[PDB]
Amino acid sequence: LVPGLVNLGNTCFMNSLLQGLSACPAFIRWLEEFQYLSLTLLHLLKALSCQEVLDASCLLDVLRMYRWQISSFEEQDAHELFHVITSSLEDERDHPFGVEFETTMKCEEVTKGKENQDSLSLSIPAATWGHPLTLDHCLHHFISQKSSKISRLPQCLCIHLQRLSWSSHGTPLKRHEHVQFNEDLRLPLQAYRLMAVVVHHGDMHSGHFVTYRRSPPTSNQWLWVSDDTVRKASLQEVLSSSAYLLFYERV
Amino acid sequence: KGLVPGLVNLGNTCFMNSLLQGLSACPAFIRWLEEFTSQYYLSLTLLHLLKALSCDEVLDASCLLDVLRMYRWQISSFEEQDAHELFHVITSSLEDERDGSGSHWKSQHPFGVEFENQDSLSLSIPAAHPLTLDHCLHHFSKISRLPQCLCIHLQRLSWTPLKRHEHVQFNEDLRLPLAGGRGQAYRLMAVVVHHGDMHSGHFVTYRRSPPSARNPLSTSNQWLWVSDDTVRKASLQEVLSSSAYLLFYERV
Ligand SMILES: CC(C)(CO)NS(=O)(=O)c1ccc(NC(=O)[C@H](Cc2ccccc2)NC(=O)c2ccc(F)cc2)cc1
Ligand SMILES: CC(C)(CO)NS(=O)(=O)c1ccc(NC(=O)[C@H](Cc2ccccc2)NC(=O)c2ccc(F)cc2)cc1
């Protein structure tokens, strides 16, 4: 068992994401290699690792004291919080999640630039009849896509599936469809092993966020965390879930 | 920690505080002003304001209006014109300070672009199919030589006046082509954004944080939302999604 975290009104995504991040030991190690946000984040993550209930108001307070208006983030996609944490951890340095793309632009002449991202955000493609939605199809659809190729892969990989779509009328909707994912995922040139899965439940304006993650030691027994409620979980329960964020580590 | 000081609103100076926060996010402009003021005036007071803004203090931009009064400008006329015109009234008067100088008369400011030598690249917004900055650049007597500090003015005012609301894509890196090595690459330093109807004075600047004293001359990754006295952080996605009015870029 791992400690749970309490909900401060709406906190569910933050504690789901903290539970996911604690299941990334290289990210933990890099924080160890590093009041400032990195140390609070390490304290939160090391407490959620290493096998009562906890409180992560310290994270909200260090963010606010850095003049971040967190109450405007419940109106955005949950994933933008993750991008804020990684972008603020890079401010303390100047990266375990960093993926790096080499892009070429042309229209006579060409120009090769470099771009960096904290995760891989994949559009959920339309399901054709007779073939289920797989994460390899989304990854291939994101790779196919001014060109862009992956030229540096991260040690810890975050994969965000854009479950929040927007109609042509401008009104938003949640894609409920299930994407098949395996715990062993080979990125086409490296190989990665699944560590945690953040899932969303209910309508889009509900904040019901839940994390499946591995037990701390790499271990083999999965855990379901919804705030204070922590229990044992099977792998088929993890793989049958409707994934929103996937946290992998390089094998 | 990593914040900038805010500014006050005297009547309606909200665009002016927006422009000052945008202009102090260009380090090459501040270096040019530090060199031009070694003569010894708009350049001296403007550099004082910009050097203060790029560092919970709040400063008084009132002094800028005063030197705008001492250089024989009407000021109060600017409420009946487009906001960007005040920028021209800055740059033109700086060029007027270039002439009549026996010390630094060949020291041109970093915003000048050759076509004619102009102060900023004004682009008219077409209609459509999302709008992107490259569509506006393609719709643009072409550019001849590119400035060190680049200002892009998007024509949100069309004509009886009309406010254009449509969002246009812009990127943190922007490359512009010319014949040979003349074309150049720029990085986004600040975004001035308009809100509300065309006569609302609501202007907001998204600007990068000042460089740290542990890594000087290294550009920060953090962005700030600035509305007069109110300064807060802002994510990158918030900056890239805003209906931009002015785009301040620096040559990389
Ligand atoms: C509360 C606080 C901001 C601190 O006060 N922190 S938080 O708990 O981490 C935190 C809590 C909630 C959110 N947002 C949401 O749930 C949005 C809310 C939302 C819904 C529609 C349009 C914009 C915003 N929907 C999702 O993301 C979502 C993701 C996948 C889905 F399939 C369906 C929905 C973000 C962060
Ligand atoms: C001297 C003083 C301190 C006081 O004026 N200057 S100031 O504060 O910097 C200063 C403050 C405001 C303005 N202009 C406006 O609001 C015009 C007002 C206006 C509107 C229609 C026709 C003529 C004039 N609208 C804009 O530009 C505008 C830009 C982009 C948009 F999508 C929508 C509107 C100019 C200057």
Residue numbers in the entry:
A (entry chain A): 66 to 99, 114 to 130, 136 to 178, 222 to 234, 239 to 276, 294 to 301, 318 to 353, 359 to 361, ...
B (entry chain B): 64 to 103, 115 to 129, 135 to 182, 217 to 228, 246 to 258, 262 to 273, 296 to 301, 318 to 330, ...
Authors' text:
Consequently, the mitochondrial deubiquitinase (DUB) ubiquitin-specific protease (USP)30 has emerged as a critical negative regulator of mitochondrial quality control due to its ability to remove ubiquitin from a subset of mitochondrial outer membrane proteins. By grafting structural elements of well-crystallizable human USP family members onto the periphery of the human USP30 protein, we generated stabilized and crystallizable protein constructs that retain DUB activity and the propensity to compound inhibition. This process is illustrated with four diverse chimeras: chimera 1 (USP30ch1) features the fingers of USP7, chimera 2 (USP30ch2) features the fingers of USP14, chimera 3 (USP30ch3) features the fingers of USP14 and the box 4–5 insertion of USP35, and chimera 4 (USP30ch4) features the fingers of CYLD.
The ligand was surrounded only by USP30-encoded side chains as well as secondary structures generated by USP30 residues, with chimeric portions of the sequence spatially separated. NK036 was found to be engaged by both the palm and thumb subdomains and extensively surrounded by protein residues. The two central amide bonds of the ligand are contacted through a total of three hydrogen bonds by the protein: the backbone carbonyl group of Gln160 engages the anilinic NH proton, the carbonyl group of Met448 contacts the other amidic NH proton, and the carbonyl group of the fluorobenzoyl moiety engages the Ala162 nitrogen. These polar interactions give rise to a star-like tripartite geometry of NK036 with the hydrophobic portions of the ligand extending into three separate areas:The fluorobenzoyl ring binds into a hydrophobic pocket formed by Leu328, Tyr495 and Phe453 as well as aliphatic portions of the Arg327 and Lys338 side chains. While the catalytic residues of USP30 are not contacted by the inhibitor, we observed that the catalytic triad was not aligned in the inhibitor-bound state, as the catalytic histidine was flipped out. The superposition also revealed large and surprising conformational changes of the switching loop that allow the N-tert-butyl-benzenesulfonamide group to bind deeply within the thumb subdomain. Notably, Phe157 moves more than 18 Å and takes the place of Trp152, which is pushed out toward the fingers.
